[PDB]
A and B are shown apart, each in its own frame.
Chain A
Amino acid sequence: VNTALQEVLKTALIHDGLARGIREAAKALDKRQAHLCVLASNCDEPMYVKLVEALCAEHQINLIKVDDNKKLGEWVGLCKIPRKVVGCSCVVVKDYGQAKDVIEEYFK
């Protein structure tokens, strides 16, 4: 399911629609421009890991859970060439540009 999400996050980087960071994720969520959300499963502090799916359910936004945050960050383009490896725990794709249909039927 990860390989069918890598292409849609890549085309999100192509069309610059995704919002990196928790702040921009929430700001895309409450504006009702959001299309889907991606959340890292490695979250030590628990008071924000349950807020993201609460906002997604309040705004009827689908959610994908990934195990790693550094790998998610280097997939969404938070690294430069890589020397510095920094990752994000949450990112919301606001709009897209094959496997995106696979993801959207996996939601259903």
Chain B
Amino acid sequence: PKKNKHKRKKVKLAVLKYYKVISRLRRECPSDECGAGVFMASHFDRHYCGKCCLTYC
């Protein structure tokens, strides 16, 4: 019943999904503190901003 510590998934080339070749493949969060690079997590029903907890659905 020992509780194993959570391990972060070491994903290969996390940078190489928001750009082409130019434009932003993901959305940009329109808040004041976040923008110009804060890409927007696109889950199968929603979008989330990972810094200031913006929520769109």
Chain A directly contacts chain B within the complex, with at least one CB pair under 8 Å: yes
Is B13 on the interface with A (CB-CB < 8 A)?
yes
Quick one: which of A30, A48, A50, A55 contacts B36, CB cutoff 8 A? Answer: A30
- We find that the number of chain B residues with CB closer than 8 angstroms to chain A is 11
Is B57 on the interface with A (CB-CB < 8 A)?
no
Tell me the interface secondary structure of chain A in the complex. helix
With both beta carbons as reference points, the residue of chain A lying nearest to B21 in the complex is identified as A54
**Distance (whole angstroms) from the CB of B36 to the closest CB of chain A:** 4
Q: Report the interface size class on chain A.
A: 10 to 19
Does B16 contact A48, Cβ atoms closer than 8 Å? yes
Interface pairs A-B: 3 shortest CB-CB: A27-B37, A31-B36, A22-B15
Does B13 contact A48, Cβ atoms closer than 8 Å? yes
Asked, given contacts A50-B21, A54-B22, A58-B22, whether A23 binds B36 with beta carbons under 8 Å apart, the answer is: no
Number of A-B residue pairs having CB atoms within 8 Å of each other in the complex? 29
**Distance (whole angstroms) from the CB of B26 to the closest CB of chain A:** 12
Given contact pairs A23-B14, A30-B37, enumerate 9 new A-B contacts (beta carbons under 8 Å).
A22-B16, A26-B18, A26-B19, A30-B36, A47-B16, A48-B13, A50-B21, A51-B16, A51-B19
Given the complex, which residues of A lie within 8 Å of B36, measured CB to CB? Answer: 30-32
Does A48 contact B21, Cβ atoms closer than 8 Å? no
Please report the C-alpha to C-alpha distance between residue A26 and residue B13 in the assembled complex, in whole angstroms: 13
